[PDB]
Every structure is written in structure tokens, then in C-alpha cells.
Write a protein that binds this ligand. Structure first.
Ligand SMILES: CC(C)(COP(=O)(O)OP(=O)(O)OC[C@H]1O[C@@H](n2cnc3c(N)ncnc32)[C@H](O)[C@@H]1OP(=O)(O)O)[C@@H](O)C(=O)NCCC(=O)NCCS
Ligand SMILES: *SCCCCCCCCCC
Ligand SMILES: *SCCCCCCCCCC
Lengths: 334, 334
């Protein structure tokens, strides 16, 4: 007997810019491996990693996230004032509450804008990019900041001969806003719950809290299970992303898969049938697996080098913990 | 050349149903006052809480969340098969990773459907409804379970005379899907990072993990600051929620504020200039504050008691940690 208004926002949205932040401390394979039993070679050939960046003690995912935003905003040619919202996506904010998002907002000068934390393993960014495009088109925001941020350092077990050499630290954000032409395709996402513990924190925080004498919680990865999963499944997930975007594989300019493993991403490239000249993201060689921050960071590295250029038609594929996956086709920012 | 394609979905969406789970174990006011200097009369008058529910030890944000989803699914007349995505929104998932959302989807038998965790303090549910609808309108999903779940019992310092009686346990899910007529108005939200520390974890998990034998983290609350905040700021918040929906104050039949404290909520009622006979959610009486679970648990209480009616016009205002608020106008579910 009484109507709730139906509204709408702008129909064309894109990645206005990207802005990266990588902590200054460089951690070679020799440093990493000398505390287990391995070698430079052994790590390089199984993963693709050479060096990785670890954050300083006083740095957090929120701090790094703040610095990332500032740069995206700078690159987008905008102030904090132009932003209606921030989505902080991450798995390494070490407080149950308050959420990182508002803190990131306050640091920027836009104290009062909307914002939340989003958790979907490594594929968080994919879901965040996704959620922002839907919110702008819905008419609940005109311009937004989405930031992938991570400080995985303190979570690594230095005695874990499987994954201590994998995870690293950093942040990178995109300004999502209205563009003349459609810049972000429809989100393609899904997951696999049976295999949740493939990538996990081994002990919950409260169980750890109630029994201090036990072992502390560290990150644990089941290599073969996660390799197999991503390597043989994300190809089709990649095809759907382009299916929804109305784009043929021959037309993909830039391939940004999550930087978990160079061997995984090598297999996905053959599988996806791209041009022989398609620019594959390989930021992992000097960044490592920065989880939810991988793709945006990876975008900026391709951008920094020139291998990718603003407007290039990019396939973004994210896969990781929870066994989650979120892909879209996008145009390149900056 | 080569344009990125857009998808579109249902123009009008709404709360098809609500499913609620509260754990069997009642904890009385006297029982709370064992490890603090207080009484039943002191707690009830200053909060409006008489009793609350504490979860069993084998339970969790995920277990509870799952139970709530079934209850919702059953009320809407749907099975897992009908769901395309799930959003778990919590502050008491005690794993940095993996997200609860996948494990929850798995538990229901929708193993591969999309989803993720959303963290925005107490206003979590507000954002999650907002993102759910936004996604469905953008055509990335046709029908979604949004579940707010919380196991706060283990985060409570039983010696905290300031809050040990405030927080409780439970979960509640809604089903969002297409409806004949508009059922959820735009989302109005925002934050206050300056006062990020009003509701908090006092010690992050990493700091604590490197010093396990010392003080462990609990939830902290700066009573007056949050009272003062909510009591004088949520008025215009709600006003904005009714403005976007194209409804007047006199038109709201059911007010559902976040269940922080009955006093705060009575002042909201007055400030909002609702009808004298408008129905006001007071689920706190035997549920206490369940953060991101409160609003939808409230919706359920009113429906169960026949105090609210399906399709009744409703105003939802969420407020809490990070200093985050999300609010919308909706028609009542179930
Ligand atoms: C903190 C709160 C409980 C009131 O306590 P308070 O008066 O600020 O506590 P103080 O430490 O200043 O002590 C003041 C007095 O209260 C008395 N007191 C008695 N029982 C008390 C109790 N259970 N808790 C706190 N104070 C109590 C103290 O003895 C003290 O003595 P005095 O009045 O003779 O000086 C109040 O802010 C409150 O109701 N909080 C929850 C409701 C709320 O604001 N919720 C928003 C949550 S999101
Ligand atoms: S997809 C990989 C993301 C890694 C997140 C794990 C966070 C660390 C958990 C151990 C405390
Ligand atoms: S709005 C209330 C949000 C508080 C969530 C409780 C968990 C916070 C960490 C306490 C250890």
C-alpha cells in the first residue's frame, strides 16, 4: 500500500587507477631457506619466487592499505573528498573488531564514508572489485576505493618446509568509478567448501587463547591439493569470466592470475588459449604470494614496467583459501 | 574496439524470509553477577537485558550460521539449490582464514556457490543486506542467503563490570531474492574511524601470539562514548534511510534498531518521530547484544510474537564497532 523507491546509479564503471605499496625490507631466498633446509634453486623452480618483501614491526595491513589508497587517489587525480566508500579486503587484519576499513578511511581524511572488511581468502579482491561495481551501479556510491592488503609475515612458521618461502607482505588499491565505456565485466565467483582446510590457520584464536602453553597458530598450505585444484579448475572459471564479458580468449591483452605459484599460472595460460603475445602477470618473482593483494599489486607491476598499458583488456583470476575464486574481465587503469 | 558487456538482474528484491537460531543455554542476570559487583535490577534498567543466550563449546560462528540458514531456507520455501551466493557477516570467526561463508555453503549442500565474509562491526548485517541486493540487481545472483552470526561469549572478560553483561551468542539469516514490488530501499551507511577504539579488541592476536603467557585479548567498550554517539547520530542516519526509500517517519510500522541498549533505542524512537503505535524491536530483553546477528534476530522475534507482520514497513539501523552504521528501509520477511 506504500512504495519503497527504486533508484539507479551510473551504468559504466572502471578501474580509474591503481596504487601500490611494498614494504622496504627485501628478503631473498637465501635468508628464508637458511632457517630451514633447502636452496635458492629449489624454491625458484617450484614456485617462481626469487626475493620477497616483508613489512616492518610497526606496519599493519591497515597502514599499508592507507598508503596504497593515497597512491591510487593520486594516480586517479583525486582527493579523499571524491571517495564515497572503501572496501578493505584482507585476511591479515589481526583484530576481530573494529574493522580495518573505517581506520583506513580516517587516515585518508574522509573519516565518515561507508566501509567494510571483506574476507574470501586470496580471491577477496575479486569479490571486493565485484561488490564495488554492483554498489556504484545500484546508486549507493559514485566513486569508491577498493584495497587488497596483507601482512602475512607474522603468520609464517619458519620451520615449515612447505610454505615459509611462499607468503609475503604488501597492499594495493584501485579507484573504481564511472567511465564513458564499461570498464569492469560481470563478477564470476564460486567456491569449494569440502577443501576449506587446504589453506588454513591451524588453530583458532580462542582455542589458542585458552591454552597458551600449546602451539601458536600458523598458516598451513596443502601444496598438491591446491596446485591440482587451481591448475585444472580455474581455466573454466577463466572462460566464464570472458563468456560474461562477451570477449573471446584471442582478445585478452593482459592475464592477471593470483600469484600463488609460477607453475600453476603457466599451466593456466596454455589452458586458457590466449594469444602467444598476451602479457602474463609475473609479479611473484619479487613479491611472493601476497594473498588478497596479489592481483592489484600485480596490475601495478605490469603497469610500472610498460608490459601493460591503460585500456588493455585484462583477465583477472583470483584463487586461494576457503577454496574461493573470483574472476572478471577489466580494462587497465591509470 | 571490443566492448565489455554488462549484465542486469531483478529490479525489485526483498526479504523473502528470516530464519533464526538461538542456543538453548540461558544465562541469567544473577549468573552474570558472579564475577562482578552488580545486581539484576542494575543490569535490566541500564540496558534492558534480563537474560541472554550463550553458545555450547562445540559450536561456532559457522555452526550457528549454518543452522540459521536452513531455518531461513525452510521459511522461504526453498532448498540449497535455490541459492546462488552466501554472505556470512560476523566479528567472531576465530580464523584469519578460511572464510566461514564457504564452510557454511558446504554444510547446506551448495558446495560450489559464491560467497565471502563481511566485517563491519555491529553494522555488519546492514552492509551485507545492502551488498546482497546490489549484487542481485546487477545480475550476478538471483537469490541469496545473508546470515549474521556471532559467538561473543569467549571474547567476554567476566571481570569487566562495564560490559560482561552486554554481549551474547546467536545467528539469523535472511533470503534475498526477486519480489513483485520493491522490498529493500537503498543502503545508507558510514563510519567514524577516530573513535575506532570505542568498541574493540584491546590486544591484536599477533602481539599476543608472541607473548602467550601474558594478558589475553577480550572485548572492550567505552560505554558513554558509544551511548553518546548512537543516541544523537543515528537519528539523522535513519532519517536518511527513509529519505532514499521515499517514505515518511509516520509510514514506518516496525522499527528495528540494532540491539545495543534499550535506553539508546527509546531515544531513537522519540528522535525519529515515529507513530505512537509503531512497533519497536526489543529482542535484547532475553538475547542481549549479538552484534551482526541482532537486527535479523530482532526481525524474527517480532514476527514470532506476532508483533510484526510480513510486509510491514520496517526501518533497520545498525550501529557498533569501528564506529560503523548501516541502515535501510525494507518490508518485513517470513
Ligand atoms: C558504564 C555504565 C555501565 C555506567 O557505569 P559508570 O557509572 O560509568 O561506572 P563508573 O566506573 O564511573 O562508576 C560510577 C558509579 O557506578 C557504581 N556502580 C554500581 N554498579 C555498577 C556496575 N554494575 N557497573 C558500573 N558501575 C556501577 C559504582 O560503584 C560507582 O559509584 P558512585 O556512583 O557511588 O560514584 C553505562 O555507560 C552503561 O549503562 N553502559 C552500557 C549501556 C551502553 O551505554 N551501551 C552502548 C553499548 S554499544
Ligand atoms: S590464499 C592465502 C591467504 C593466507 C591467509 C592466511 C592468514 C594466516 C593464518 C595464520 C595465522
Ligand atoms: S559492535 C561489537 C563488535 C565486537 C565483536 C567482538 C569480538 C571483538 C574481539 C574481542 C576479543
Amino acid at each position: 500500500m506504500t512504495e519503497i523507491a527504486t533508484t539507479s546509479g551510473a551504468r559504466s564503471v572502471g578501474l580509474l587507477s591503481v596504487g601500490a605499496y611494498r614494504p622496504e625490507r627485501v628478503v631473498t631466498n637465501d635468508e628464508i631457506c637458511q632457517h630451514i633446509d633447502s636452496s635458492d634453486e629449489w624454491i625458484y623452480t617450484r614456485t617462481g619466487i626469487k626475493t620477497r618483501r616483508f613489512a616492518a614491526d610497526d606496519e599493519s595491513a591497515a597502514s599499508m592499505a592507507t598508503e596504497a589508497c593515497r597512491r591510487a587517489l593520486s594516480n586517479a587525480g583525486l582527493s579523499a573528498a571524491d571517495i564515497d566508500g572503501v572496501i578493505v579486503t584482507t585476511n591479515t587484519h589481526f583484530l576481530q573488531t573494529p574493522p580495518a576499513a573505517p581506520m583506513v578511511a580516517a587516515s585518508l581524511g574522509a573519516k565518515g564514508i561507508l566501509g567494510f572488511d571483506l574476507s574470501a581468502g586470496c580471491a577477496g579482491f575479486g569479490y571486493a572489485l565485484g561488490a564495488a561495481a554492483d554498489m556504484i551501479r545500484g546508486g549507493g556510491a559514485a566513486t569508491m576505493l577498493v584495497v587488497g592488503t596483507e601482512k602475512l609475515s607474522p603468520t609464517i612458521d619458519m620451520y615449515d618446509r612447505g610454505n615459509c618461502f611462499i607468503f609475503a607482505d604488501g597492499a594495493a588499491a584501485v579507484v573504481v568509478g564511472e567511465t564513458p565505456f564499461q570498464g569492469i565485466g560481470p563478477t564470476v565467483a564460486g567456491s569449494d567448501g569440502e577443501q576449506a582446510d587446504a589453506i588454513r590457520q591451524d588453530i583458532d584464536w580462542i582455542t589458542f587463547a585458552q591454552n597458551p602453553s600449546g602451539p601458536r597458530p600458523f598458516v598451513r598450505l596443502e601444496g598438491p591439493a591446491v596446485f591440482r585444484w587451481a591448475a585444472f579448475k580455474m581455466g573454466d572459471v577463466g572462460r566464464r569470466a570472458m563468456d560474461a564479458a562477451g570477449v573471446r580468449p584471442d582478445q585478452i591483452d593482459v592475464f592477471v592470475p593470483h600469484q600463488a605459484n609460477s607453475r600453476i599460472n603457466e599451466l593456466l595460460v596454455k589452458n586458457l588459449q590466449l594469444r602467444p603475445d598476451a602479457v602474463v602477470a609475473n609479479d611473484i618473482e619479487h613479491t611472493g604470494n601476497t594473498s588478497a593483494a596479489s592481483i592489484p599489486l600485480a596490475m601495478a607491476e605490469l603497469l610500472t614496467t610498460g608490459a601493460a598499458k591503460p585500456g588493455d583488456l585484462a583477465l583477472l583470476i583470483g584463487y586461494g583459501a576457503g577454496l574461493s575464486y573470483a574472476a572478471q574481465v577489466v580494462r587497465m587503469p591509470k
